[PDB]
Amino acid sequence: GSHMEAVQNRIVEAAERVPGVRGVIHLRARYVGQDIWAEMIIGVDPENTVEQAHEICEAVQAAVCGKIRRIESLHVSAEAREGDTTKPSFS
Amino acid sequence: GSHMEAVQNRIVEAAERVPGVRGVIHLRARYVGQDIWAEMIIGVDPENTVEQAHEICEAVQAAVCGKIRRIESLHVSAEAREGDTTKPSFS
Ligand SMILES: [Zn+2]
Ligand SMILES: [Zn+2]
Ligand SMILES: [Zn+2]
Ligand SMILES: [Zn+2]
Ligand SMILES: [Zn+2]
Ligand SMILES: [Zn+2]
């Protein structure tokens, strides 16, 4: 599992460094050839507007794609979160 | 394709009847046995707070799950949308 574990760890670490991110709630990734396709859901402040949340999604996309060049496709979106124990995370 | 086409059509129709939904942007579903597992992203007003958006997600989950009894698992979340031509939809 190490290849995908390493990729997922790097994605989570990069996303969590972006201000406004409240953990990574969901993450799925696959190799296609030597490239990676991934979809992720970050936690965000519930009081953000959806358009403010999306600015966080865009910042996460930039950070993750910039740091991990094998990623060819990344979809980021958000759900509400807080030390939250009511949703999954990689925290 | 008819089995899954029919399911997807029913999911989209049910979701679009919920006030606050601005189209279905993304939808993936699979059978597991005779049951359905699905994940979907709805469009919502960008000026909603994320917590207001989530009330729409919950209303969509109730509507879709209530109308289509074979669905055993449904994850609904949201992205910003408006006659929007900048994101995909089933519109
Ligand atoms: Zn977003
Ligand atoms: Zn964007
Ligand atoms: Zn979720
Ligand atoms: Zn939601
Ligand atoms: Zn909920
Ligand atoms: Zn999307």
Swiss-Prot record, chains A, B:
Localization per Swiss-Prot or TrEMBL: Magnetosome membrane; Cell inner membrane
Annotated positions binding Fe cation 3: E79
Family: Belongs to the cation diffusion facilitator (CDF) transporter (TC 2.A.4) family.
Null allele phenotype: Single gene disruption has no growth defects, no accumulation of magnetite, forms empty intracellular magnetosome vesicles, decreased levels of MamB, mislocation of MamC in 1-3 foci or rarely in a shortened chain. Magnetosome vesicles are fewer and smaller, aligned in a chain with the filament, only a few have very small crystals. Other, possibly precursor magnetosome vesicles are visible. MamI mislocalized to cell inner membrane or in 1 to a few patches.
Record note on domains: The C-terminal domain (CTD) is probably responsible for hetero- and homodimerization; it assumes a V-shaped, dimeric metallo-chaperone-like fold that can open and close. Val-50 forms the hinge between the dimers. Binds up to 3 divalent metal cations (probably iron in vivo); upon binding there is a conformational shift to a tighter dimer. If the CTD cannot fold correctly the function of the whole protein is decreased, suggesting the CTD confers functionality on the transmembrane domain (TMD), perhaps activated by ligand binding to the CTD.
Gene name linked to the record: mamM
Remaining remarks: This bacteria makes up to 60 cubo-octahedral magnetosomes of about 45 nm in diameter which contain membrane-bound crystals of magnetite (Fe(3)O(4)).
Binding-site residues for Fe cation 2, renumbered to this chain: H54
Native source organism of the sequence: Magnetospirillum gryphiswaldense (strain DSM 6361 / JCM 21280 / NBRC 15271 / MSR-1)
Amino-acid positions noted as binding Fe cation 1 in the UniProt annotation, renumbered to this chain: E39, H75
Region (C-terminal domain (CTD)): 5-91
Induction of its expression: Part of the probable 17 gene mamAB operon.
Oligomeric form and interacting partners: Forms homodimers via its C-terminal domain (CTD) in the presence of metal cations. Interacts with MamB via their CTD. Isolated CTD forms homodimers.
Role: Essential for magnetosome formation; required for stable accumulation of MamB. May nucleate iron crystal formation. Probably binds and transports iron. Binds divalent cations, possibly up to 3 Zn(2+) per dimer in vitro, probably iron in vivo. One of 7 genes (mamLQBIEMO) able to induce magnetosome membrane biogenesis; coexpression of mamLQRBIEMO in a deletion of the 17 gene mamAB operon restores magnetosome vesicle formation but not magnetite biosynthesis.
Name of the molecule in the record: Magnetosome protein MamM
